[PDB]
Amino acid sequence: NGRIARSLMKLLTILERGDYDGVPSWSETGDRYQLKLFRDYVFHRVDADGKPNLSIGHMLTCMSKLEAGVDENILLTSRDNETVFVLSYRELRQMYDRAFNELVK
């Protein structure tokens, strides 16, 4: 099927575009900030002492739950721990889809 590969490519397509510079929705007060934090949650994990946690099981599991839009909640946090969200994969899937559609139209 290859849904995860396509979802990974959608993440790369959606996130960190140069055109987002100076756009409020992608700032820490904007309504798409959680999309950056989800990327951090999955792919920029570290243990205590700061060593990258590159566990592939975590990555594929999170991407799979995202694709299925399951009701499970996860804790998204900024690096400085001053932003803390509780979001479901269900909501995150909807939010990524919204961001993607902004690129299509």
């Binding site: 592939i56 804790l75 932003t83 803390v84 969200f85 509780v86």
Partner: protein
Amino acid sequence: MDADWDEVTRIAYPAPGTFPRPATAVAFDPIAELLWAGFDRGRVCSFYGRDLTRYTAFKIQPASEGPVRQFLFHDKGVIVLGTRSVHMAMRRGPALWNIRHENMKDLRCMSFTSKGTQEIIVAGWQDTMLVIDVLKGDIIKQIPAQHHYSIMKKSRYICAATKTGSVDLIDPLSFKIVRSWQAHASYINDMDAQNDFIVTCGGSYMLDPYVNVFDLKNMASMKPMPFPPLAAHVRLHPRMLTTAIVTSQHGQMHVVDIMNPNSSTVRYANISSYVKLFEIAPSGEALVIGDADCNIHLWGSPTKIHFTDMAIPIELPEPVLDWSETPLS
């Protein structure tokens, strides 16, 4: 009132060791079992349940634009007032909208208007008041402020405390000033308005030995409620509609009845410094007192304490043999 009430929980936020800057705004959520706190540098966080466990957190403005001013609450989420902007977020954290404008210069207070929770008006130490559509996150219209305002509470009218010890009684529909009430000689330190009463603390730096009282139904001032320790903060009880709780600057609290003032109950909150914040839960079964040492003291009956009418649990994240992890390669 009750007798078994006590300090149930004390937390220090921000945590000692970074830094000694207390919350600048606090409010109990009417819909979720959350205490909301706002801080300098535009930081907000919520605390859940009787143990005040940190829940969600977010920013509402750039760090350079100072403190959080006030909270309001909507079915869709929490409205947060900053100095030059207005923010709305999900209770679970993510931003819904963030409104800035040239005429948002020094905001201090805000209130719902005549459309239930659909519409708010924001104001401050500035000549303009801005009316906002909460659902759309849009400014609807702008209205001159007759005076600079520091505090807003809403009952029958939008009650707006000025910088000169007066309260303007504003019609929520037309926004005209119906009546102005000189509650204290030179300044107002605190104000609440609930169920056709206004209550105030204030002075003539020097606080008055009473809580002044205004009858909104009959539109007349009432005999002040004596408070010898000097009244600093006051809140009306949400279930006992003629009862107020008053505290001194040092945490001496009196439960008093506006209709029978001489009858009173006295409790002492052991705070290490002076009171900064004082709020009562919508349930009337909890209150918080925050001091200048960043302590947040939660009071209530140790067995019955809860913040909202429906004390619901909130959306949270989720062995002998548990061997093993494969790194990405």
